């Protein structure tokens, strides 16, 4: 059978450079193109380009031409993806996957590497800016926006009636998450609704009272 | 030039037959081979159909690939759905030797009745605006299947830059929640009058709107 094996995770600082490798086995390396495909967090599969392991011709997708460089060594049956001057935009699971016949024959199935996680993060402990979400029904929904923090651990608790706590979003190596609470429209703003935001990594609790406009 | 078009959500009960479709646009579907990739949440993708309709070893014959010249489309069909078939499915084909991929479809195997999203749009805080930033927040709760297309309008101009949505995530009750964030400057917030968040779920759009 056929195996594509990839380098470990790269947890890097922005501006660094990485070379992810792809070792192949169980087939003549030169019979099938090697394709590179990335997956940003919670995104679909993005195609980056392919290596013609027979001609040595390298094709890059539009958006990946410049800082991304393909190479191979036929002697070790290994393809390579080099990424130069890393940005937080680049953080993704980067995938090796075997392409189509470079000769006249089938069995051109897409075998995937296990994937290779590339994180580019300052890793810099940042407390969250915490802002109130009030509106402009018998029920009324309030919220706390927890914007631009690192790392991932935060808890949100309410005092005033059910709570929804949204999973965090990664943008430019910083995290943003939201929490909402639905109360009876009689209990707000007549009575006080306050969220407490805990960020253990920076040792900061902040309370934000939700005021009407 | 060639794009491959997929719907974002297909669903069916256990035992039922569903088919994921992938319309070719700007090239004939039969000019080039079609592959199907399954990715289960957590794991890496594997080939499931290759060369249009062929199964790799250990893919059950109830997974099935077809092409239709009339509608310029290929289809993945899965008979007698099991839980394991819950996954993202991508079609792949070639243009000028290069790969083209569909945006992916989520096949949901239904373990509970459909649930339309509850949607709330929040304006920015005045606190936030004093830092030359304005983040609108669109909360989305209690939807199944867990696939949602979010579209921001500002005075009837669709926003293509400044919006990000979270991947949908399970609640206690195995329904899904998501949040979309439109980020503007304060001076951009003050410029425009009306802001829409449109959330599309199983081909039905519910939109929340507000004025500055």
């Amino acid at each position: 059978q056929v195996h594509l094996e990839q380098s470990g995770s790269e947890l890097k600082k922005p501006g660094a450079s990485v070379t992810i490798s792809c070792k192949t086995s169980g087939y003549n390396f030169s019979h099938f193109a090697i394709n590179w495909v990335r997956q940003a967090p919670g995104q679909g599969l993005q195609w980056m380009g392919w290596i013609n392991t027979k001609t040595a011709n390298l094709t890059y997708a539009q958006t990946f031409t410049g800082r991304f460089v393909f190479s191979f060594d036929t002697s070790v049956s290994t393809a390579y993806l080099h990424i130069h001057g890393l940005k937080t935009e680049d953080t993704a699971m980067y995938y090796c996957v075997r392409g189509g016949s470079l000769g006249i024959f089938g069995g051109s199935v897409g075998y995937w590497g296990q994937g290779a996680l590339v994180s580019v993060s300052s890793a810099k402990t940042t407390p969250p800016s915490v802002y109130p979400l009030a509106p402009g029904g018998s029920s009324v929904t309030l919220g706390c926006l927890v914007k631009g923090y690192f790392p991932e651990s935060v808890t949100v608790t309410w005092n005033s009636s059910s709570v929804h706590t949204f999973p965090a979003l990664l943008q430019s190596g910083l995290y943003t998450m939201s929490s909402s609470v639905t109360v009876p429209s009689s209990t707000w703003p007549s009575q006080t609704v306050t969220c407490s935001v805990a960020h253990p990594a920076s040792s900061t609790t902040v309370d934000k009272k939700i005021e009407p406009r | 030039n060639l794009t491959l078009i997929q719907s974002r959500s297909v669903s069916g009960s256990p035992g039922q037959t569903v088919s994921i479709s992938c319309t070719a646009n700007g090239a004939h579907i039969g000019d080039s081979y079609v592959q199907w990739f399954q990715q289960r949440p957590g794991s890496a993708p594997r080939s499931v159909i290759f060369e249009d309709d062929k199964r790799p070893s250990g893919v059950p014959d109830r997974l099935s690939g077809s092409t239709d010249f009339s509608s310029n489309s290929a289809s993945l069909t899965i008979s007698g759905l099991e839980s394991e078939d819950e996954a993202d499915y991508y079609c792949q084909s070639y243009y000028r030797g290069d790969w083209v991929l569909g945006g992916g479809t989520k096949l949901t195997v239904l373990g509970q009745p459909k649930s339309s999203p509850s949607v709330t749009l929040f304006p920015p805080s005045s606190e936030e605006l004093e830092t030359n930033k304005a983040t609108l927040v669109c909360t989305i709760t209690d939807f199944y299947p867990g696939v949602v297309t979010v579209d921001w309008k500002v005075d009837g101009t669709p926003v293509t830059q400044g919006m990000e949505t979270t991947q949908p995530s399970k609640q206690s009750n195995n329904k899904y929640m998501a949040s979309s964030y439109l980020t503007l400057t304060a001076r951009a917030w003050e410029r425009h009058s009306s802001y829409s968040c449109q959330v599309t779920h199983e081909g039905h759009t519910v939109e929340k709107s507000l004025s500055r």
Partner: peptide, 9 residues
Amino acid sequence: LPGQRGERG
């Protein structure tokens, strides 16, 4: 015959 990756039936 075919000399382009993916160009066939």
